[PDB]
Design a protein around this motif. Structure first.
Motif, PDB file in Angstrom:
ATOM      1  N   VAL D  73       0.796  -1.220   0.000  1.00 45.66           N
ATOM      2  CA  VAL D  73       0.000   0.000   0.000  1.00 45.66           C
ATOM      3  C   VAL D  73       0.821   1.258   0.000  1.00 45.66           C
ATOM      4  N   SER D  74       2.098   1.172  -0.300  1.00 49.87           N
ATOM      5  CA  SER D  74       2.886   2.378  -0.311  1.00 49.87           C
ATOM      6  C   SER D  74       2.671   3.061  -1.639  1.00 49.87           C
ATOM      7  N   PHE D  75       3.359   4.171  -1.857  1.00 49.57           N
ATOM      8  CA  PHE D  75       3.300   4.894  -3.128  1.00 49.57           C
ATOM      9  C   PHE D  75       3.602   4.001  -4.316  1.00 49.57           C
ATOM     10  N   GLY D  76       2.838   4.200  -5.378  1.00 52.44           N
ATOM     11  CA  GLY D  76       2.792   3.316  -6.523  1.00 52.44           C
ATOM     12  C   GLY D  76       4.072   2.903  -7.208  1.00 52.44           C
ATOM     13  N   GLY D  77       5.027   3.825  -7.256  1.00 47.47           N
ATOM     14  CA  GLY D  77       6.309   3.566  -7.878  1.00 47.47           C
ATOM     15  C   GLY D  77       7.030   2.462  -7.145  1.00 47.47           C
ATOM     16  N   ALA D  78       6.833   2.417  -5.839  1.00 42.99           N
ATOM     17  CA  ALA D  78       7.470   1.422  -5.007  1.00 42.99           C
ATOM     18  C   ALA D  78       6.937   0.037  -5.265  1.00 42.99           C
ATOM     19  N   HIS D  79       5.648  -0.027  -5.571  1.00 45.78           N
ATOM     20  CA  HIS D  79       4.906  -1.272  -5.665  1.00 45.78           C
ATOM     21  C   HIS D  79       5.647  -2.374  -6.349  1.00 45.78           C
ATOM     22  N   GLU D  80       6.176  -2.072  -7.524  1.00 45.61           N
ATOM     23  CA  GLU D  80       6.722  -3.074  -8.415  1.00 45.61           C
ATOM     24  C   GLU D  80       7.775  -3.945  -7.765  1.00 45.61           C
ATOM     25  N   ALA D  81       8.807  -3.310  -7.247  1.00 39.61           N
ATOM     26  CA  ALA D  81       9.898  -4.001  -6.601  1.00 39.61           C
ATOM     27  C   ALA D  81       9.454  -4.779  -5.383  1.00 39.61           C
ATOM     28  N   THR D  82       8.523  -4.211  -4.637  1.00 38.23           N
ATOM     29  CA  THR D  82       8.045  -4.846  -3.433  1.00 38.23           C
ATOM     30  C   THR D  82       7.281  -6.115  -3.765  1.00 38.23           C
ATOM     31  N   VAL D  83       6.483  -6.082  -4.813  1.00 40.89           N
ATOM     32  CA  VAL D  83       5.686  -7.243  -5.177  1.00 40.89           C
ATOM     33  C   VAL D  83       6.592  -8.383  -5.653  1.00 40.89           C
ATOM     34  N   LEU D  84       7.555  -8.042  -6.492  1.00 41.38           N
ATOM     35  CA  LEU D  84       8.561  -8.994  -6.927  1.00 41.38           C
ATOM     36  C   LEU D  84       9.286  -9.665  -5.755  1.00 41.38           C
ATOM     37  N   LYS D  85       9.628  -8.879  -4.750  1.00 48.59           N
ATOM     38  CA  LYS D  85      10.260  -9.394  -3.556  1.00 48.59           C
ATOM     39  C   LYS D  85       9.364 -10.366  -2.842  1.00 48.59           C
ATOM     40  N   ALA D  86       8.101  -9.989  -2.720  1.00 48.70           N
ATOM     41  CA  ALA D  86       7.096 -10.825  -2.099  1.00 48.70           C
ATOM     42  C   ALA D  86       6.936 -12.134  -2.829  1.00 48.70           C
ATOM     43  N   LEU D  87       7.191 -12.107  -4.124  1.00 49.17           N
ATOM     44  CA  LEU D  87       7.076 -13.301  -4.936  1.00 49.17           C
ATOM     45  C   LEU D  87       8.218 -14.282  -4.644  1.00 49.17           C
ATOM     46  N   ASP D  88       9.264 -13.789  -4.005  1.00 47.56           N
ATOM     47  CA  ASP D  88      10.335 -14.644  -3.538  1.00 47.56           C
ATOM     48  C   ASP D  88       9.876 -15.442  -2.324  1.00 47.56           C
ATOM     49  N   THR D  89       8.812 -14.995  -1.670  1.00 44.35           N
ATOM     50  CA  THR D  89       8.260 -15.746  -0.558  1.00 44.35           C
ATOM     51  C   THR D  89       7.077 -16.561  -1.011  1.00 44.35           C
ATOM     52  N   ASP D  90       6.407 -17.171  -0.049  1.00 41.33           N
ATOM     53  CA  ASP D  90       5.237 -17.970  -0.301  1.00 41.33           C
ATOM     54  C   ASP D  90       3.927 -17.316   0.185  1.00 41.33           C
ATOM     55  N   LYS D  91       4.040 -16.086   0.650  1.00 43.60           N
ATOM     56  CA  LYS D  91       2.910 -15.356   1.159  1.00 43.60           C
ATOM     57  C   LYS D  91       1.946 -14.871   0.064  1.00 43.60           C
ATOM     58  N   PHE D  92       0.690 -14.740   0.427  1.00 42.40           N
ATOM     59  CA  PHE D  92      -0.273 -14.134  -0.458  1.00 42.40           C
ATOM     60  C   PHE D  92      -0.065 -12.618  -0.509  1.00 42.40           C
ATOM     61  N   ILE D  93      -0.445 -12.038  -1.628  1.00 43.38           N
ATOM     62  CA  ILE D  93      -0.165 -10.652  -1.907  1.00 43.38           C
ATOM     63  C   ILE D  93      -1.407  -9.871  -2.342  1.00 43.38           C
ATOM     64  N   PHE D  94      -1.762  -8.861  -1.576  1.00 46.78           N
ATOM     65  CA  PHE D  94      -2.758  -7.900  -2.003  1.00 46.78           C
ATOM     66  C   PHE D  94      -2.096  -6.559  -2.259  1.00 46.78           C
ATOM     67  N   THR D  95      -2.133  -6.103  -3.498  1.00 44.46           N
ATOM     68  CA  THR D  95      -1.590  -4.804  -3.812  1.00 44.46           C
ATOM     69  C   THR D  95      -2.648  -3.816  -4.290  1.00 44.46           C
ATOM     70  N   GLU D  96      -2.619  -2.628  -3.714  1.00 41.45           N
ATOM     71  CA  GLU D  96      -3.384  -1.528  -4.234  1.00 41.45           C
ATOM     72  C   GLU D  96      -2.868  -1.264  -5.612  1.00 41.45           C
ATOM     73  N   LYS D  97      -3.709  -0.716  -6.463  1.00 43.25           N
ATOM     74  CA  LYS D  97      -3.261  -0.336  -7.780  1.00 43.25           C
ATOM     75  C   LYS D  97      -2.193   0.732  -7.622  1.00 43.25           C
ATOM     76  N   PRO D  98      -1.272   0.813  -8.583  1.00 42.38           N
ATOM     77  CA  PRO D  98      -1.141  -0.034  -9.759  1.00 42.38           C
ATOM     78  C   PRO D  98      -0.412  -1.329  -9.442  1.00 42.38           C
ATOM     79  N   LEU D  99      -0.451  -2.276 -10.369  1.00 40.19           N
ATOM     80  CA  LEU D  99       0.394  -3.451 -10.270  1.00 40.19           C
ATOM     81  C   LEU D  99       1.871  -3.021 -10.347  1.00 40.19           C
ATOM     82  N   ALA D 100       2.137  -2.082 -11.245  1.00 42.96           N
ATOM     83  CA  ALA D 100       3.412  -1.416 -11.365  1.00 42.96           C
ATOM     84  C   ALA D 100       3.205  -0.222 -12.283  1.00 42.96           C
ATOM     85  N   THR D 101       4.111   0.746 -12.236  1.00 43.65           N
ATOM     86  CA  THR D 101       3.908   2.003 -12.951  1.00 43.65           C
ATOM     87  C   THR D 101       4.344   1.961 -14.397  1.00 43.65           C
TER      88      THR D 101
END
Lengths: 339, 344, 339, 339
Positions: D73-101
């Motif tokens: 839920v941080s500022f959108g530009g950040a989203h992308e890298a954070t989601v990719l990092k999360a994908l290194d784990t096994d946790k579920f991911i809810f991201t506010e839009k955008p998916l990435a900028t």
């Protein structure tokens, strides 16, 4: 004193005007008629119980010195030539749309009337007389929503006759919005574009595109989005929304019919006929024309310049209809005669 | 000066707001009539009407003088309601046609008087101005009700709302000037007859400025078939003029929609539409239709077909009962006589 | 920390409260149930996957010390005894209306609660939690329409079940407006009268008068006119209109569903179930109650005193139902405990 | 049992999500937070009475093995890298839009997600969960108005912050319509065109055009006209109207507030913030995500593929903002992973 009227064209349009002048409005009388179909002319006199003579053509009727004003209510293609002739006389003139079916012919009429002592032509764009539309314009002009930025409108019709062509989407339907918008905004058009969404399965006229989307632009930059939908099935409806800097204005829903609570629904009837929807407008429009004539003063309704503006815009629209490209419009400043 | 088919020459008695409105319509909108004479208790008001509507018309000092002008075909009685009775009575001494605004009279005795007198004539000449019957929306509602789509009418709920009243507006006029409309309307709407009426006084409004005026007022009416009518009378409501009508049926409901031509405004955290402030403006169609019908009958020298002195009398019986109810807020029974042949 | 709940009565409303407490709201757990039908009770546990114990009766459920609060959601006539028993405990108490089916029964309960250190009872008058209704009261309280002079309301129901009696027009239906109005108006009733218009042909229940008109009067002089129509067929609808010195307020139409333009009509769907209509109100009511129990603070919602006021008014109404005569109401002064 | 949640970003939207998870919805607990402003994160813990760890960044939070799911839920530009990092784990991911900028970034995430043994990402397109919007779609899907020919919509906002840019008219505002329409119509886009009417005088941000007109086309030929207007002053409003072959459907007015009769008008309030408008939608959306995670099933809401579609369309639109020219869109077939 009574305004003595001659009517040129006695089809349904002409007949409706006759009925209006004879039975609804005050201060006028139809004393002459003509039509290309002489028998339809005779039929008008008969059906409406008129004390009127039947002239064989517009020229002869127009020579009758006892006629104060003429209604040019023949089929559209006939208007140009007839208006032209009447401009030879001192008679006041009410023509239905269009002023002419072509843009040089309209320019001609304007040029000719510009030679006269005074304005005599009123063009039958009734929308301007509708109480709802008028009240909206008035509210807009207060400045309450600031400058108009966008206009969204709809011209909705349930179904069309077999003879309704693609061009008629402009000439018979959109023409109303075409006259309306520049009046509403007190601004001039700089472009029009016609686009076509997916074709409705409801269409069964060759070459007719439905629905159509018309986008217009103005000098001050206001953008107008009009939906034209003539096989909509559900009803006849005119919607109008002005988007302003600080607010919005739109037409309310039309209808005097009761709200019915029944069978897990709440519902109100929707008008099916344009004739019924605009009864008031037509009455008001023609009563004003008569009122002005009775005073021997020029009409104050839509002028030949208005007709010409419409003709121009429609020509542009018909051009856009071929390839869906934007067509530029440049309307010369309003002559003082038409100011 | 007798056009398309004979121009009715009209005299107008009373040139207040309503009288002015009738003059306007008769002159500028409607067909086949001309106002050739007026009068008002205030001679300057009469004169102003002639001026403002550009009439070529005589200004008479009173009703009697005007009524003795042989050139007038019909008169409109548009004076103070309590003035109607005497004027109608006087008029019935002529052969002129008579359109009187509601009420027919302010008393039952008055109304009966007029009926008694008119009954002595060869032909019916009086039309009473119950314009609700001509309102397009109200008619549409009735039409729909009469299809049977909501079954039998069980309850009617209505409101007669008015922003403010003049200093001459009395408690009794809550009935005779205002509720009179609903009184005529509901029996016409339901094709039924009343059996009682009851007036109750809720919490008195601080907006009242007239001594002895109770506002708002609640009127409950019962009919032969058992339909209960609940009317809200509110004449210092401030916000606007408004007529509301709701019919509760066995299998559904019908309701009058909101009246307005004006645009919907989105502004300042609100979506809003104008409410009409004047009853004159609100019922302009009803008035036009009604008055044109009257004129059309006069032209042919035939009796009016709209609401009659008998309808006036029926209403006056109920009104009287209401004025009585006003005294103790108790229910007052009503039983109207059968319609005389003259009025059928 | 989590509020542990015992539910008394696991009929339809009971299962609803359990489902809400389990799967919708936050901060509670149902750990005990009972019902006259022990199998209904067993089912509830089973169907909602509770870790709960099933008791034979109310009294026994009440001796469980793990329970923080009880929901009394049994047949209204059993409510009274159950509440009185619960009051012999320390537990918070939510009861569906009515508090008691006789005012003597309501008085008994209040008198008993009045011997406690803190208030524990909330009565389930959910209307007060409906967003629309609240918003109307809030607007009224701004003073923007002046003092409320008249209230007009409707309680519309499409059809009733075979157990529906004439007295239930008051006790099950009108009871909501009975609680609502004095709260709406910050007032107290002085009388009530029930009148019968012509009987609907839709009525199939023995002894049932429909529709019913209820007229209440208040100390400040406001007159309330309620239409009760429980065989109306078309839908379920709650209407509320407040008539003020300088204006009016009314509820808008309930509905999230689309406006349909079709077949010469404009229409919206009408709700058929009071259950669906009041989802939000119920959720809000109960969540607040739980929120208060979680803090060991007395409920802030409708009280036993509110229950009593309602019982007295309802009794008066059932009396009026005999002969359609006005019945007086004299609500005693509110004890400080309930202020 | 309880879904243990980490929240990345504790600004306005993050705090709202925290409030939702903690005080409104059922079956979740926030046990870890981080923000680029460490103090904001600490404040969040205080303000919401969380038993949660404050992490210095996203990476570190993601190392927490107790966390079942993360909210990005941080500022959108950040989203992308954070989601990719999360994908290194096994946790579920809810991201506010955008998916990435960047549409390139969106694809990167999709590509990475396709390597996994179950779908983990839900993208926060809340409009799909709005009861009104859903109900319209459902009615549309019955076929009662035939085929959808045109859609007209409005996204109205009263004023924007000083940090609101021209491109955000697409990325922060129109993005909701960008996801919505293709879902509503079950169709894909073929083009988008952004057009500038005259500039509002209310704009106070350098470079921002307002209003803006967005036209989208679909494969089946449906034309979508969206009005974006973010300095409208009057309030916040979402409008939706589907024009069909045999009828029309539109969202009703939003508001539970009362109708006020006062001062020669009849009025209802208009929401001033997006916040109340979509409370229901947000609640429903997140409760769904939590419900799925609790079962350990993949989310059923909008996915990273929907995020990709939106990104492609958004990018094409930011391109159109340069010259107001039409930009084509050709989205690839949906991988089976995402059906």
């Amino acid at each position: 004193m009574v305004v003595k009227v001659g009517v040129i064209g006695t089809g349904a349009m002409g007949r409706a005007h006759i009925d209006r002048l004879t039975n609804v409005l005050t201060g006028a009388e139809v004393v002459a008629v003509t039509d290309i179909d002489h028998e339809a002319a005779e039929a008008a006199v008969r059906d409406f119980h008129l004390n009127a003579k039947v002239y064989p053509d517009d020229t002869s009727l127009l020579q009758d010195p006892d006629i104060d004003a003429v209604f040019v209510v023949s089929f559209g293609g006939a208007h140009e030539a007839t208006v032209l002739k009447a401009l030879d006389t001192d008679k006041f003139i009410f023509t239905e749309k269009p002023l002419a079916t072509t843009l040089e012919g309209a320019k001609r009429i304007v040029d000719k009337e510009l030679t006269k002592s005074k304005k005599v032509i009123q063009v039958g764009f009734m929308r301007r007389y509708d109480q709802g539309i008028r009240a909206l314009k008035e509210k807009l002009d207060t400045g309450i929503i600031g400058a108009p930025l966008v206009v969204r409108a709809s011209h909705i019709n349930p179904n069309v006759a077999s003879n309704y062509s693609n061009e008629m989407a402009i000439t018979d339907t959109l023409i109303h919005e075409i006259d309306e918008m520049h009046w509403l905004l007190d601004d001039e058009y700089t472009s029009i574009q016609i686009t076509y969404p997916r074709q409705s399965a409801e269409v069964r006229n060759e070459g007719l595109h439905d629905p159509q989307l018309a986008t217009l632009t103005t000098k001050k930059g206001t953008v107008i989005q009009v939906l034209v939908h003539v096989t909509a099935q559900y009803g006849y409806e005119v919607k109008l929304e002005v988007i302003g800097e600080t607010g919005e204005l739109q037409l309310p829903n039309y209808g005097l019919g009761p709200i019915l609570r029944s069978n897990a629904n709440q519902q109100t009837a929707v008008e099916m006929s344009w004739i019924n929807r605009f009864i008031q407008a037509y009455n008001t429009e023609v009563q004003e024309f008569i009122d002005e004539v009775a005073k021997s003063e020029p009409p104050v309704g839509p002028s030949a310049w208005d007709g010409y503006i419409a003709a121009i815009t429609a020509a542009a629209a018909n051009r856009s209809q071929k390839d869906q490209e934007t067509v530029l419009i440049n309307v010369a400043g309003t002559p003082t005669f038409y100011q």
